[model samples]
Target: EYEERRDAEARRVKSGIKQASIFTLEECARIEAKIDEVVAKADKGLYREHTVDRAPLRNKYFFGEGYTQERLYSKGEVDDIPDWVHELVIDRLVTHGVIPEGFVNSAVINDYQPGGCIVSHVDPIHIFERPIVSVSFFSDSALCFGCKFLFKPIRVSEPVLHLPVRRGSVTVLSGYAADDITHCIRPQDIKERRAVIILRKTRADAPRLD
Candidate 1:
């Protein structure tokens, strides 16, 4: 039912909608294999802790060197991902919106366990012009978005949508969704939540040098 909803939403986009789909068994195996490889070779301590104000939040492993701020991973820098997975994501972006008109530059892979959650926030300022595409796997988790939290400090309203993303599903956020709203994944309870891979695309003229 959720898969059908995602497909229908994708079709009705006057602007755009995030689509979620379950990967086939074979596809899931390939993705897991890639994850294992990436994790094995990932640079330890390369991950700096991200903080808000003075409190530490989460760990980030950058894809390349020279990233002074948050995590940054370059495409093709790592050999973990299978070619087909890359192509499938590219095709989805083109069909949904983005691609020929845009370019995917980097990916940020996040790992969250039970009780690990991202605070309410927008993306980094550098990626404003590029649309963000997020692919989630390993377990079921809830993602929320909307304008309800902008006014309140802590007593914010509930998300306009509470998305329960299953393992092997993909969700793309772009356009007004990228600009007007804040999105976050809530912490899980008992089960171990694992990974989220995001692919972002920007226009050629968009600033990357800065």
Candidate 2:
């Protein structure tokens, strides 16, 4: 029932949303614990420190396949997502068809601190299709989500919306919402630490999975 409803909502946004969804606080806590354990055993998750004065955002990688390029445009093997964590997410997140039954293969854990933020951008390559999902825990932030012309890919649309996504919220973006819209977050919006686990599927052409 939940999966059916969720999938329908993300089907194609005439423009406003994919689906307004969430995780239970307990579920988020389980995720938060795993992230801490995995990230610590892993190396520094910092990226392009030169781009930000204080290194506002940090990333940890776990994959069913492997490591991805800096832009996340390409993926290669580094390590499979940890056994315990992989099953945990699969069991908790897969029910939604927001992600398919066995298609999940990558997990990018992002830690956003007080001054953290990212600019607008799209996930490149056709490796995976709609339902690129991101779930947040521990705080609230406004995602400035809006779309652009798919054909032009340059002339952005109007009436940008400020979405207040809160703790335990699992936001799914598919179709036009996934491809045409690029959302961003500002540094000023970060009031506390945030853990965002992004789920990416194994593309048909994705090397390892293929």
Candidate 3:
């Protein structure tokens, strides 16, 4: 039964990825301000390192509904979304028709400093639902997507889909796009600092680390 559902999900991911510039320049500034507040709270322990493949990202913070995804080393225990976050990012996405209201229950925000990059991979399917959404801020970059790992010698030079993720744009990764294909950003792509806010739904049966 799990295999059958996995197969169905694989197909769905193939066509589930979406991207759009959902915020105006002014709106993006407001969102950036809210993100700055979170960054300011980092020293207070609200945000922590988000490591992938053994290396930690520049910054990682999770929130709402006690999210825990072992694959990403994310464990957020907050059961409520911050009002500023809801009004500035999540709610705006809903108003713009990028996601339905109530579709998201948890979030992970990352601040990518210069020279930072994420390796190719897929989110764990067992812990989160489909249609994960991400919003970009600060700069423009591409989200590289491919079926296999692109980190290998010679393989790294091969062609892959480079989806432009402009600052203020929102991207949705669903179905096969969320399960079968791998997505990442190379270090060279980060010419300056960048930040992203990701929203997802946690599965009821997902195992908790705490």
Candidate 4:
């Protein structure tokens, strides 16, 4: 019954930004534990410092360096992501008609505070040759996507996905939505937002994945 309801909601929910979500209580708990472990011993210096439109905001840790943001963990540093999460996400993506069979190899975990905001940008192709999956944990925020204009403010009918990423909800975006459309997130309050974990897959020879 619950599964049916979630499926219905996923189908009915519409936005220019394509995505899907599934609420899994058990997976949430496991993910939370892993997050706590990483956060407790994470290397603070590894975080790449960045300012928001000139104002100094918190540091952002990218899994790779070429993209500008520093990384919290090295490639394969986390060793193993929870198997359940891996299975669930891949299944959900396939079920939603997104990507083919593949494994997520790299990730960029960004820690955001109340006022921090990632400017509108497309996911860099350098990160991976495959589609990337983003999972939000521990807070809620607004994600903006669409084309931008230079002069008089170009309005591209970009949908504002107010993703109130509750404690454990998994949000997955991939395929055309990830490659063709760009996305950004703005946190309303410092204390309210936590971190965004980007799960990506790359070719065996890709240095970013290493």
lDDT of each: 0.53, 0.60, 0.72, 0.52
Question: Which regions in candidate 3 have their CA more than 4 angstroms from the true location?
Answer: 1-14, 44-57, 65-80, 147-159
After TM-score superposition, the amount by which residue 81's alpha carbon in candidate 1 deviates from its true location, in angstroms, is: 8.7
lDDT of 4 by residue, 1-210 (tens): 956764444333332234555647676566656665555534443333321112355444333322333222344343344454456554565565655655665455666767776666766654466556677766655565543423456323334333455554445555544565566664443456566666777544444322
Q: Write the per-residue lDDT of candidate 1 for residues 22-107, one digit (tens) a residue.
A: 46757766776775555554534223332101113333433322122333333333333335445655555567554453355445
Deviation from native of the Cα of residue 137 in model 4, angstroms = 0.8
Candidate 2 deviates by what RMSD?
8.0
State the TM-score for model 2. 0.70
Clash pairs, model 1 backbone: 63-72, 63-73
- Tens-digit per-residue lDDT, 28-103, candidate 3: 8888888888777765554334311123547666666433335323354342567887888888888988788888
- The C-alpha stretches of model 4 lying farther than 4 A from their native spots are 1-18, 43-102, 147-166, 189-191, 203-210
> Number of clashes in every candidate structure?
2, 2, 6, 3
Score candidate 4 by TM-score against the native: 0.57
Residue 113 alpha-carbon offset, candidate 3, angstroms: 0.8
Which has the greatest TM-score?
A: 3
Once all C-alphas are superposed, what RMSD does model 4 give against the true structure?
8.8
User: What ranking emerges by TM-score with the best candidate at the front?
Assistant: 3, 2, 1, 4
RMSD of each: 7.3, 8.0, 6.4, 8.8
Q: Per-residue error at 42 for model 4, in Å?
A: 1.3
